[PDB]
RNA sequence: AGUCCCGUGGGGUAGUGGUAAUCCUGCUGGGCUUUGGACCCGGCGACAGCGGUUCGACUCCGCUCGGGACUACC
RNA sequence: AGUCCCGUGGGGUAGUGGUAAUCCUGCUGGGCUUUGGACCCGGCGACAGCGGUUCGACUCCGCUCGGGACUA
């Protein structure tokens, strides 16, 4: 799709958990817990004039704490402890593995964040490496920055009295790797994302769910920056990019037509309720009140498929769905939906709409339908301008969906509590000359030097047990058996624990096949 | 405040803080603003603030700067009158996100900018008398504050809030209790969490102190969070508060008493029902204090010499922080007696904090009494210290000082000890 | 021990204590036993013990006396052996209602007579090493105890209980923690209420301590009432306990930790689950201690001179009890530095007691850190003091000492501080 | 009944509450509280069996955050002597012509009763060798003590008794008199006198306030203390009635020996003997047991005291442990039971016609524990009269309660300092004693034109210090009375 | 993308790492059918596919083809 | 000893600081009883006792005595 011609500029931001014994600026363990919180702490973050009454109300948070799994650090009741060395070491290694240039002195900062996921109103982050690069068929891609930050608390519930986060994840080490913001080749983006992943898997990193997080930033000339969050599957990056390029192009064509016919967006909301006194659609008939708005010249464009399956109206529907509401009804799709033309003509008439423009109605309770229509007008206005910068999420297919605006520029100042960390070049080399082998290397090396088949070696690496590992037996017991135990047991007891002992007692009394039962007891 | 090699390296290119510079290394090349470097830190490194927002430290041993741009230096009545005095405590502020540096802010305006809620509580007046870190505070400044509060309160103020630092806050409140007599409330406050933080407890602490400064409780008090939650504040009687934790928002607890009240930016709850009402007293100011007072914590091994060196140094009084019930090693007797022969008052308090001293129960105690020691009932040690300073500034008659120490004057002594005064 | 006039005319008739006499005066005439008269009391009077049982004082300025009469276990095994040592603390006794005077009693059988219940817990062995009032305790006796215990535990004792005085108990336990390594429990105990009383806590405390002494927890500890109720006892980890109240039965509270267990004459409930098990340890004893260590509580006004005086006196170490977070007046910096220039270690701890020090947060702290002060995490001031004594007793290398202070040797320091650690 | 010949020795023990601002060795106020206690303290006192004695020492104390302090709980050492207390204590002392001590010393009266939280009572002698005058002669007042009142009970559960600490510590004055009076008429005279003097000082007026206990003695008789003798005018009677009971029992003993009576602790389940009886009481009774007392016949019903018999005493000892009233040979021929039945019990229990039977119709479990007591008392009958603690009944008689109090063992309360009674401040009262009510009455009358009734009431209500005169009074002595309406 | 289940004669239905698979149904030799069926002997015909571990794998581990359940920005 | 009620014609029952008390019923005059019952107009007959307070107290205060309740 002539990428370099539409001016496609992509970027990648990868966050990775570390799997260190202790958290970053505190000593608590790096694992989450399902246990019931020992203490719920009520707090309120603070801004910076008629809203300093509504804004505040949206900053009331409840923090779940644990007498064991949490400390005063997570609660903002005790200053952060000094930078966790183990973390910085992995961070550095990773950086070096990316050909980055590790900093001479590490300085912790406070990225302003009144989101609630942070108990202090900020996130502690620090820059560790810079100007790095990778190698891809498509060419050499530069890696801009490498930062070590605390992961945020996690959300648990939302109630009248605001959001409720849990502090267990708060503090777990993280590395934010950003790449050049102007990629240009979809296939290249997937290559970088993949290589980065394989590098991260080359160091002490958490493996599992929440673990990694990848956010791509697609862009197009005369289009707009849009962040796509949570793209679990890398194989699908090409696809979601291409599909995004289409959506911005479609949205652009729609911009040019709205201008072709000098469309206008009137924030005038009409109480088109009497028009449905006797209607044939339960949805509305059972709806409290019902309002509608006109979009001049917008006809025929709210239903145009901008992306395989979704239409502009869908975008509007998504913009409007916030503030509550099922799904907006509109001219280009309303001839149906259990409503006859005599009715369709009734709306156009009551709203005073020409045959060239269209109407978007909302059947709900007046108080909100008003707030909802105000949004479909906001987006309507944006369509006149074109593609709007927003944070979307990826769907099962390659499409995406609106979530919220784009992140504001990250305001951040000094975290005076934590000392500076000088990275003595001496210890920096004791690493750069001992970087870890990639997974691929691990597999072949381990194969080549133990007779392990590709399969057994593949699994042993996949499960991170290569370090533990008749050879073909000791492996077939951690790559095969131990997985079978995650179905009838709690093998998460101690690798090297019972294993040490039992593995010995296989040299004397205890047939190969006894293993998958002996250790089990433990 | 760079030093050595750094400054030398940074000067030789005529570069100062704020200056956008470009540093080149054999394998790197940064571009950012130069930031002042903490003195604690040692040279060889230059702090730069990269475009992305992060501060970095770069080794100059083999650098090379180039300036790219020089720095840049851009009353409704019907509501009570409350003065917000800052002694050095910062309960509100503003940050310059272009330096990363946080800057205080104690103005009737600034405070309002940060705590609008105030406008419905009272009419703010907030100058900044002076400024000393709570840690570096001394007797001299107790007075200086008592004098400062006396003013505001004399110039027509329905209440006065003193923005003090946490560390010593209780000592100070003690002082103000003995040196001030008031018709209006005087509430000390501060924050455990820097005010620049969005989580800072400064906000609730201030507009709850302001709220209290309105109340009918006219005594010198301390108002801080009552828990780790941002919901209430406890109004603590001045001569019965003590910072019991090094970091928790709820560090201040009432010791040999219970919180006098429970404040909110909306109202008070007055739990204690026996206190100095509003008008009832008339503004007097006993600003006389004897800067010289020993305050010696007893402990196993302590030497009489320490006590002696104090008498020799012309110390007018000694406040010993003994072992449970009001004790201290027998080897100290001679010295403590000697102090008496020298007309130097010696009072006893317990390290336990929670409790009432009774030097009558055991022999060690009785002999200590025999040597002229003054039991201080259930007065918190630091208060007994603060008091001696005041009392010995009110007279030089040993005998009288001993009388005034035992004399309950502001609430430092409580005749009886309730089961409710020792939760855990 | 009568004095002056009293003795004069009590002598001039050849009468001693215990003798039944008959005193006659112009308006009265008593007949009772003469009783010893505490020294604190002044002469002029003679303590008689009337026939009814009531002791009374009679002014002899116009008296006249006349003598009327001169004065006058098993070992069933199958039960753990526990040694009960007494350092001066009395946890059981007998009263002679013929004098009104109570006298101690610390024999494997006396305890048994007053605490039969023990017979089913373990086999009692109770010598009485030495005797010093908890008030008058000193570092040399920490050792003497350290030695005493090591003995019993060496002569085959499944557990050892030391009957210590309350006042300074926590200091000592702290000491034995550092000085001793143990295969069996070593539990300190005592009574806030004299053992002579029928209500003394001594009973439940002693037979809970013994219970504990049998438990699997093998480290130096303190076992005392957990509430004012006579039901349970908390087993406190020695390097984390403090006498928090002047008199209450539940005076001893775990500070920057929770109680290790819940003891009862019948069993223990081990709340904490991470502790030095039984056999795991091999009896070692580092009884060396540097008896000269400064322990100065910081305060508004403290002068450098005290710190110097200490350096000048040849003090090898200093433990400051600073203001929250670990501060002390800016004015002591120079002295604190000079101390460093002299190879004298200086440790910081907070008066708050509750909490962890972080001399990095504020300037004052950093500057103090710059002068070489050793932050002590969350170690209680008195244990940091007890610790310095031991450490400077194990080396003279300043750097080494700074490393040892910071090193968690017996649980003095907790890496993290749980919310459960600050109830109120 | 010519007392001097029977060898009667009488003694008076009176305790008065002082009504001072704060308690004795504590600051807490001097009034009780009915409000719900804020804290229940669980405790155990200790002896000095050690498995069942202990269980009888479990105590729960009710505390108040305000009307109670740590001293009451035994969680804080006794503050020093309450000056105001020692003041009135002395005043009363001087008023009784006693010799105020030179140095007051607080003692610890051993008291493992539960009434106090420490395991003892704080008492101190203030005066001695005092005297009063009655028409029958001059009577001596031995000692005057200032002690702390005890805690008051409130409940008894399976986990022991429950005390409230509000009364504990209220200042008390124990006034003792010669324990050898001999003239009942004279004892009433001193009891009265004492009363008027106590009522002449700052003293508590009301219910639990006063407490008089006299001890009756009989030559060849026994020591017995009468507890709580509310009405003084009734003293001579209860004494007389007591002496009767002593003499009466000095005979029931000799008869029991004359016939070498024996008490067999053998309890019989004489239930089938009443399969079909004519007495609701038993027929409706769960089970029914009985016991035999050899030779006891004819003496269980002997009137030992005007109106009550030995059996009554037995009924008394048996009453505890639950039970209405024991049935017995000497009173059983009636009670709604025929002799055909009376002969049925004597037979079933195997009793000679010289001995008697004592039956109990109730539930087996208790009737057994009840009969074991009637046996206990029965055996005591063989021995005679025991020194015991009894109470006064509506009329002049008395009733068993518990053994005689143990010798008061006591040592020094070292937590409280001594108090020297400045001879100089002692006369500052010595010559300022308070006027007795009698004197107040007259004086007010004499100088206020107040009628006797008016001055009487004013004094009776202690408003004299408060008070057209006749009106100022008539609205303090009359209307403020309607106030409590 | 993550967790996870199902895939057994021609039709359905059980159950299993082993010297290998249950009935009903289908189809067929004989017996008894006083040249139906029913019943009685016996026959035919399955483990989804590739690897890894294994002495041997439908049976344990992984990957495919096939159906599905569930979860997928904080 | 406590505190709270009651203590009213022979018996019962309401009601009260005041120029002081209710009908029921017993007793008894007259009438009718179409010359028994019974109905109908009436009469005799009380507010326990001593005080204080009151211009006058059963009804206010205390105290005797008696009946009743509860509390220790
Ligand atoms: Zn933590
Ligand atoms: Zn009290």
């Amino acid at each position: 799709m002539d990428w370099e011609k539409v001016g496609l500029k992509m970027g990648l931001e990868i966050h990775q958990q570390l799997d260190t014994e202790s958290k970053l600026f505190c000593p608590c363990r790096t694992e989450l817990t399902d246990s019931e919180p020992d203490h719920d702490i009520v707090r309120n973050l603070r801004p910076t004039r008629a809203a300093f009454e509504e804004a505040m109300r949206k900053l009331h948070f409840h923090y779940e704490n644990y007498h064991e799994e949490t400390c005063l650090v997570e609660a903002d009741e005790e200053p952060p402890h000094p930078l966790n060395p183990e973390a910085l070491e992995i961070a550095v290694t990773i950086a070096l593995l990316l050909n980055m240039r590790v900093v001479d002195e590490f300085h912790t900062m406070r990225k302003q964040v009144i989101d609630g996921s942070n108990t202090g109103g900020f996130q502690r982050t620090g820059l560790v490496a810079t100007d790095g690069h990778l190698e891809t068929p498509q060419g050499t891609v530069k890696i801009e920055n490498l930062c070590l930050e605390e992961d945020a608390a996690r959300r648990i519930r939302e109630t009248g009295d605001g959001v409720v986060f849990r502090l267990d994840r708060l503090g777990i080490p993280l590395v934010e790797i950003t790449t050049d913001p102007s990629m240009s080749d979809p296939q290249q983006l997937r290559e970088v994302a993949y290589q980065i992943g394989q590098i991260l898997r080359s160091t002490r990193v958490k493996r599992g769910l929440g673990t990694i997080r990848q956010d791509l930033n697609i862009s197009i000339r005369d289009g707009a920056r849009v962040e796509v969050k949570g793209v679990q599957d890398l194989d699908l990056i090409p696809e979601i990019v291409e599909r995004e390029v289409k959506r911005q192009l479609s949205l652009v064509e729609i911009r040019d037509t709205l201008q072709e016919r000098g469309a206008v967006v009137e924030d005038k909301i009409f109480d088109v309720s009497e028009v449905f006194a006797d209607t044939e659609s339960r949805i509305i008939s059972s709806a409290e009140s019902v309002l509608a708005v006109k979009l001049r010249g917008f006809d025929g464009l709210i239903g145009v498929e901008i992306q395989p399956g979704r239409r502009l109206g869908t975008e509007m529907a998504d913009y409007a769905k916030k503030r509550g509401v099922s799904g907006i009804f509109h001219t280009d799709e309303l001839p149906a939906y259990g409503i006859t033309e005599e009715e369709v003509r009734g709306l156009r008439d009551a709203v005073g709409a020409s045959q060239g423009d269209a109407v978007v109605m909302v059947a709900h309770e007046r108080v909100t339908a008003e707030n909802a229509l105000r949004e479909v007008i906001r987006r309507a206005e944006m369509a006149i301008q074109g593609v709007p910068e927003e944070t979307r999420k990826a769907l099962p297919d390659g499409n995406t969906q609106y979530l919220r605006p784009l992140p504001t520029s990250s305001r951040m100042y000094l975290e005076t509590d934590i000392p500076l960390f000088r990275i003595e070049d001496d210890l920096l080399e004791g690493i750069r000359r001992n970087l870890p082998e990639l997974p691929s290397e691990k597999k072949e090396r381990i194969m080549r030097d133990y007779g392990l088949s590709e399969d057994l070696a593949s699994q042993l690496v996949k499960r991170n047990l290569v370090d533990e590992f008749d050879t073909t037996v000791i492996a077939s017991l951690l790559a095969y058996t131990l997985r079978e135990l995650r179905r009838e047991g709690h093998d998460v007891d101690g690798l090297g624990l019972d294993e040490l002992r039992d593995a010995i007692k296989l040299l004397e009394v205890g047939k190969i096949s006894k293993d998958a039962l002996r250790d089990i007891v433990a | 405040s760079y030093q050595g090699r750094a400054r030398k390296f940074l000067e030789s290119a005529s570069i100062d803080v704020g200056d956008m510079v470009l540093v080149e290394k054999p394998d790197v090349t940064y571009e950012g603003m130069v930031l002042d470097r903490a003195d604690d830190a040692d040279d060889r490194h230059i702090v730069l603030k990269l475009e992305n927002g992060y501060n970095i430290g770069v080794e100059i041993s083999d650098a090379r700067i180039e300036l790219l741009e020089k720095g840049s230096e851009p009353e409704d009545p019907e509501l009570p009158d409350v003065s917000i005095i800052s002694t050095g405590g910062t309960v509100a502020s503003i940050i310059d996100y272009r330096t990363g540096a946080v800057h205080p802010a104690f103005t009737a305006d600034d405070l309002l900018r940060a705590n609008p809620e105030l406008l419905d509580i009272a009419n703010i007046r907030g100058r900044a008398v002076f400024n000393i870190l709570s840690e570096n505070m001394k007797p001299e400044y107790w007075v200086e504050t008592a004098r400062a509060v006396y003013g505001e309160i004399k110039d027509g103020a329905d209440g006065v809030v003193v923005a003090h630092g946490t560390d010593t806050m209780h000592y100070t409140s003690a002082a103000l209790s003995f040196m001030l007599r008031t018709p209006v409330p005087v509430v000390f406050t501060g924050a455990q969490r820097s005010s620049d933080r969005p989580s800072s407890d400064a906000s609730l602490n201030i507009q709850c102190s302001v709220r209290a400064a309105t109340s009918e409780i006219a005594e010198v008090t301390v108002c801080m969070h009552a828990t780790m939650d941002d919901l209430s504040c406890h109004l603590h009687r001045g001569v019965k508060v003590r910072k019991m934790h090094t970091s928790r928002r709820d560090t201040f607890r009432s010791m040999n008493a219970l919180p006098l009240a429970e404040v909110t930016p909306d109202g008070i709850k007055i739990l204690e029902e026996n206190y100095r009402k509003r008008g009832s007293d008339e503004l007097e100011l006993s600003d006389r204090v004897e800067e010289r007072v020993a305050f010696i914590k007893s402990y196993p091994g302590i030497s009489p010499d320490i006590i002696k060196w104090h008498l020799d140094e012309g110390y007018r009084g000694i406040v010993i922080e003994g072992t449970g019930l009001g004790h201290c090693p027998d080897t100290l007797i001679p010295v403590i007696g000697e102090a008496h022969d020298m007309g130097v008052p010696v009072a006893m308090t317990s390290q336990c904090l929670n409790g009432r001293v009774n030097m009558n129960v055991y022999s060690t105690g009785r002999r200590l009494l025999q040597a002229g020691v003054i039991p201080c009932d259930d007065m918190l040690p630091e208060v007994a210290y603060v008091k001696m300073c005041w009392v010995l500034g009110q007279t030089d008659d040993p005998e009288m000082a001993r009388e005034m120490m035992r004399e309950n004057i502001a609430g430092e002594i409580n005749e009886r000890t309730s089961i409710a005064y020792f939760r855990g």
Side-chain angles (χ1 to χ4, degrees), chain B residues 26-329:
Chain B
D27 65 302
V28 253
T29 164
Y30 308 114
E31 276 191 56
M33 181 189 302
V34 174
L35 300 73
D36 187 4
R37 186 188 187 65
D39 301 76
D40 189 352
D42 296 359
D43 69 320
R44 297 213 307 146
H45 298 294
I46 261 187
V47 177
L48 297 184
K49 185 167 191 69
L50 310 196
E51 185 195 303
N52 52 58
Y54 293 81
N55 304 184
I56 254 179
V58 14
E59 155 79 293
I60 54 177
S61 69
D62 58 319
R64 198 88 158 294
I65 323 195
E66 285 170 34
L67 177 67
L68 313 192
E69 162 188 329
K70 270 288 185 165
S72 315
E73 48 160 295
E75 45 164 50
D76 111 294
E78 191 68 307
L79 278 299
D81 283 3
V82 156
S83 262
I84 300 188
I85 276 181
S86 171
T87 286
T90 302
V91 300
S93 54
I94 184 63
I95 295 171
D96 172 306
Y97 276 71
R98 223 59 191 182
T99 58
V102 171
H103 287 75
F106 2 70
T107 294
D109 188 29
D110 296 309
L111 296 186
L112 255 57
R113 273 171 151 43
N115 277 283
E117 298 72 71
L118 290 175
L119 293 182
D120 323 327
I121 296 176
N123 296 273
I124 273 56
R125 295 158 54 188
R127 40 195 304 295
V129 192
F130 52 108
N131 180 287
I132 296 172
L133 294 197
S134 183
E135 320 92 51
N136 320 303
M137 192 101 289
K138 65 173 168 296
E140 155 172 53
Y141 302 108
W142 289 333
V143 185
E144 287 306 324
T145 292
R147 293 175 178 182
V149 166
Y150 178 82
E152 303 308 323
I153 190 165
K154 170 69 63 183
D155 313 304
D158 299 314
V160 157
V161 157
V162 181
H164 192 89
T166 16
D167 282 56
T168 281
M169 192 162 89
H170 46 297
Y171 284 82
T172 304
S173 68
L176 243 294
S177 291
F178 303 101
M179 304 181 282
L180 205 71
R181 326 298 185 167
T182 190
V184 133
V186 205
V187 177
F188 282 99
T189 299
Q192 274 287 238
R193 297 292 140 267
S194 335
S195 72
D196 62 307
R197 311 170 180 255
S199 55
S200 163
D201 43 327
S203 180
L204 191 63
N205 286 5
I206 195 59
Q207 57 191 75
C208 261
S209 306
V210 177
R211 223 317 165 308
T214 274
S215 177
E216 297 318 272
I217 304 183
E219 301 175 29
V220 175
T221 60
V222 168
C223 169
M224 299 293 227
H225 274 68
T227 196
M228 305 185 296
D229 297 307
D230 285 322
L231 301 160
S232 280
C233 271
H234 272 333
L235 197 60
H236 302 292
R237 167 169 286 134
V239 271
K240 285 195 164 297
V241 213
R242 195 184 134 79
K243 191 184 195 177
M244 297 311 304
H245 200 85
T246 70
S247 53
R248 256 146 153 290
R249 293 139 193 287
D250 51 334
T251 181
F252 286 84
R253 287 252 195 307
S254 288
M255 290 320 257
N256 303 291
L258 296 173
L260 291 184
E262 193 185 312
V263 181
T264 277
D266 311 291
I268 333 291
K269 203 182 178 310
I270 311 280
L271 314 141
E272 166 61 5
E273 215 40 61
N274 175 190
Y275 56 91
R276 294 269 189 166
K277 302 287 173 54
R278 199 164 256 279
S280 32
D281 295 329
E282 76 140 54
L283 179 63
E284 314 168 18
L285 183 62
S286 328
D287 72 304
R288 298 188 289 179
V289 198
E290 165 61 8
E291 257 282 340
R292 316 214 85 198
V293 180
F295 181 15
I296 302 158
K297 169 166 176 166
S298 160
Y299 58 77
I302 208 172
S303 161
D305 311 323
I306 317 186
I307 299 290
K308 179 50 160 291
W309 175 83
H310 276 289
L311 296 169
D312 297 23
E313 294 305 324
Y315 275 99
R316 305 281 78 74
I318 299 181
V319 162
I320 302 162
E321 185 177 304
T323 350
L325 250 189
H327 298 311
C328 85

Side-chain angles (χ1 to χ4, degrees), chain A residues 23-28 65 70-81 119-120 124 150 167 170-171, chain B residues 193 247:
Chain A
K23 281 179 184 168
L24 184 53
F25 293 117
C26 144
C28 307
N65 295 235
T70 269
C71 57
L72 297 174
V73 180
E74 285 89 44
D76 190 50
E77 291 288 10
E78 167 150 307
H81 300 197
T119 214
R124 304 208 182 65
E150 331 175 65
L167 309 169
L170 182 58
Chain B
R193 297 292 140 267
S247 53

Side-chain angles (χ1 to χ4, degrees), chain A residues 16-269:
Chain A
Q16 182 55 292
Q17 297 201 322
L18 283 183
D19 184 52
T20 54
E21 314 173 5
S22 154
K23 281 179 184 168
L24 184 53
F25 293 117
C26 144
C28 307
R29 299 271 288 178
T30 48
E31 44 222 47
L32 292 199
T33 198
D34 271 0
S35 298
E36 206 197 27
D38 303 326
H39 193 137
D40 202 288
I41 301 184
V42 178
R43 296 190 174 320
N44 284 293
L45 279 308
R46 296 273 281 177
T48 282
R49 189 73 168 190
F52 222 72
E53 194 180 300
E54 200 291 336
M56 135 212 105
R57 192 197 317 83
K58 279 165 56 185
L59 290 177
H60 188 261
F61 301 94
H62 290 65
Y63 295 119
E64 306 196 318
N65 295 235
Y66 301 97
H67 293 325
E68 166 68 345
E69 295 81 343
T70 269
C71 57
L72 297 174
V73 180
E74 285 89 44
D76 190 50
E77 291 288 10
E78 167 150 307
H81 300 197
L83 180 67
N84 178 325
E86 193 187 336
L88 181 72
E89 171 165 28
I90 307 171
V92 177
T93 308
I94 292 184
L96 288 178
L97 285 181
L98 287 121
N99 298 93
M100 300 193 93
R101 204 290 193 184
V102 183
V103 175
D104 281 300
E105 230 202 313
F106 180 72
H107 279 51
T108 311
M109 309 269 296
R110 293 172 180 173
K111 178 147 106 295
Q112 189 180 65
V113 172
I114 54 166
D115 152 53
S117 63
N118 307 144
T119 214
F122 59 74
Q123 151 180 47
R124 304 208 182 65
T125 334
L127 183 54
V128 294
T130 61
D131 307 317
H133 71 290
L134 281 175
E135 217 63 63
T136 68
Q138 6 288 311
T140 303
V141 184
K142 295 168 159 65
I143 279 57
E144 313 203 315
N145 276 290
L146 196 330
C147 313
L148 180 67
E149 44 183 42
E150 331 175 65
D151 203 341
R154 55 179 186 162
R155 303 207 171 200
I156 269 76
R157 299 184 301 281
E158 223 286 22
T159 264
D161 189 38
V163 188
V164 177
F165 295 76
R166 175 168 308 182
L167 309 169
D168 48 348
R169 172 147 60 76
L170 182 58
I172 301 161
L174 237 62
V175 294
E176 283 193 357
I177 297 181
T178 11
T179 69
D180 168 18
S182 51
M183 206 83 68
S184 172
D185 185 331
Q187 287 300 310
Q188 173 163 63
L189 181 59
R190 85 101 70 69
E191 182 61 19
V192 174
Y194 174 75
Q195 277 176 60
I196 296 196
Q198 292 303 95
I199 262 191
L200 289 181
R201 321 251 119 61
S202 280
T203 47
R204 259 224 263 65
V205 181
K206 292 292 189 186
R207 322 85 68 265
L209 291 175
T211 292
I212 205 169
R213 326 174 74 165
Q214 302 167 156
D215 311 316
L216 356 93
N217 300 66
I218 305 168
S219 154
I220 271 184
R221 192 182 56 265
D222 59 55
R225 285 283 176 172
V226 187
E227 193 195 333
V228 185
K229 282 185 150 70
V231 188
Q232 263 96 66
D233 190 2
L234 293 71
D235 281 306
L236 189 54
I237 280 174
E239 178 41 40
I240 94 168
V241 169
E242 105 122 2
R243 283 207 188 184
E244 175 54 14
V245 170
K246 310 228 308 166
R247 190 183 67 75
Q248 286 190 46
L249 287 164
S250 299
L251 276 186
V252 176
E253 262 152 50
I254 292 193
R255 168 196 67 193
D256 304 339
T257 294
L258 286 187
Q259 308 199 77
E260 165 166 329
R261 53 187 77 153
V264 185
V265 179
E266 285 188 302
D267 54 44
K268 317 187 306 171
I269 305 189

